[PDB]
Amino acid sequence: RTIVVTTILESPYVMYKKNHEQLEGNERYEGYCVDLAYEIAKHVRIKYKLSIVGDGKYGARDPETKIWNGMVGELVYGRADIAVAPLTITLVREEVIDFSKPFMSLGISIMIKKGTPIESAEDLAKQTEIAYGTLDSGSTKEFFRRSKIAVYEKMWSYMKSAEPSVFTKTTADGVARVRKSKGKFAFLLESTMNEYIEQRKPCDTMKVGGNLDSKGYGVATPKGSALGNAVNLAVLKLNEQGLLDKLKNKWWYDKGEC
Amino acid sequence: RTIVVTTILESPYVMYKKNHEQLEGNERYEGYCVDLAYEIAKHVRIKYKLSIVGDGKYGARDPETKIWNGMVGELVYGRADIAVAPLTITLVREEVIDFSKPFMSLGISIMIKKGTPIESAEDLAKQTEIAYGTLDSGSTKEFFRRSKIAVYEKMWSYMKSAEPSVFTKTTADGVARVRKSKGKFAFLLESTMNEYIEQRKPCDTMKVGGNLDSKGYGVATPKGSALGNAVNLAVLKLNEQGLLDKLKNKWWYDKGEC
Ligand SMILES: N#Cc1cc2c(cc1[N+](=O)[O-])=NC(=O)C(=O)N=2
Numbered sequence A, B: 001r002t003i004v005v006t007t008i009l010e011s012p013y014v015m016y017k018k019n020h021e022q023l024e025g026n027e028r029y030e031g032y033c034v035d036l037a038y039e040i041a042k043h044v045r046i047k048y049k050l051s052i053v054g055d056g057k058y059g060a061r062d063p064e065t066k067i068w069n070g071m072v073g074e075l076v077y078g079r080a081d082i083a084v085a086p087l088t089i090t091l092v093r094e095e096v097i098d099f100s101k102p103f104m105s106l107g108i109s110i111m112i113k114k115g116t117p118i119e120s121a122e123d124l125a126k127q128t129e130i131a132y133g134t135l136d137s138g139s140t141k142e143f144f145r146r147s148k149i150a151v152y153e154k155m156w157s158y159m160k161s162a163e164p165s166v167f168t169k170t171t172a173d174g175v176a177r178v179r180k181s182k183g184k185f186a187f188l189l190e191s192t193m194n195e196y197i198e199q200r201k202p203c204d205t206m207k208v209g210g211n212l213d214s215k216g217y218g219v220a221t222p223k224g225s226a227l228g229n230a231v232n233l234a235v236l237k238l239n240e241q242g243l244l245d246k247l248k249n250k251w252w253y254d255k256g257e258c
């Protein structure tokens, strides 16, 4: 059979080729995860077709209906065989799907407009002149919320009662708010995205300080999948071959603009 | 049955307590992995006994006999139920034992004696005045060896023919050679170890440059062990609870001397 690989339109992981209107199948797409799926399928010896997730979501369980959305849903309800995407390895997800060992590391990070006098979380917490927020619904907001940790507890208090709202509907909106804030807004988001935006014109943003946590993205397969073991080993092999670092350099820095 | 947990005397993961003659069993030991084993056993709901690996090795396969030594061997041949140690997740190992998702990240890093005019790998590669090397057997050496990569190829060519040998028998030997070589030797090693030593008297070493690769330590179990699933979910929960970061800070920085 041709294996179905669910993925997500997130730059630079999966993006449309310029004339994608004119193209067919896997040829429609390019990016880090396009390259990754290609290399994995080579080592696992499978034919495959990329499938863009229909709701544009990674995967969360609705607190009410208990239905999984996004790519996680595609795996659990049997539409996709594997997810190759920047899907974060988390406890609730690992309970319902299997992940490979991480193909990329990351953590919560601070994005500022260049020139903003901020160099760390501690810098943000003590002051109020510069506003800061996060995505309104993800895992970054949860880190601060479910964080029994000093300075981050102070940050959460501020964010939860801030006026108006410092939580953004999308990651992209957060980024735009930093850019248009004249230095009065900072945004917390995945380090990999922060690093990516720092490489986009007009080069007006910067990542500052260390990461506040540590996580990995993994390739996902359903429980009991015949592919699980061949996918895990392929990811380890690619790391040791230097491919994964080569792909990150390619899409972040060789193709960067700053 | 009481679970056998194999581990290794490596500071600050597992170390003897002050008057250890006077103590018995698990009470003899303290450290990052002592604390980690206690937390994992708590979530997995098992009674356990720490056992220091007899040969004091992590684990490698003899190229002639094909027999595994170290903690890897203890798992593979049936003498230990879990290894709770800074055991590097690698393809050849994952082929024979199971690993949790990483509890700690790391990469190849450069250790210098303070004062040495080296800030990066590129700095080492373009000169010969200041000698540099790695452990004579492990993944740091193999990174360079099997690295079809520009500056690293140049570094491998140098180290391969350096006279006398720049490869050390032990990591501790490499660290001593940095300290005693009056600014003429730099050592390449695990970033976590580099960072730890930087925090120890007499505070004469420094970690410089970014990491050359990316890897993780994992908690290991025998292939197909019934304990694998819960150990992995335990590590993920501990990370999400912030407790892995708390342990790192405790053993590296709160207990630091520099
Ligand atoms: N890149 C990236 C991202 C990858 C993500 C993400 C958000 C972002 N992001 O927008 O920064 N949320 C997730 O729940 C996830 O599994 N993976």
Ligand SMILES: N#Cc1cc2c(cc1[N+](=O)[O-])=NC(=O)C(=O)N=2
Pocket (backbone or CB within 6 Å): B010, B058, B059, B086, B087, B088, B089, B138, B139, B171, B189, B190, B192, B193
């Ligand atoms: N710390 C530590 C270390 C942890 C290690 C190691 C060397 C060191 N070291 O001496 O730096 N070699 C390994 O093969 C391993 O699985 N784990």
Ligand SMILES: [Zn+2]
Pocket (backbone or CB within 6 Å): A016
């Ligand atoms: Zn279109």
Ligand SMILES: [Zn+2]
Pocket (backbone or CB within 6 Å): A039, A042, A043
């Ligand atoms: Zn390949």
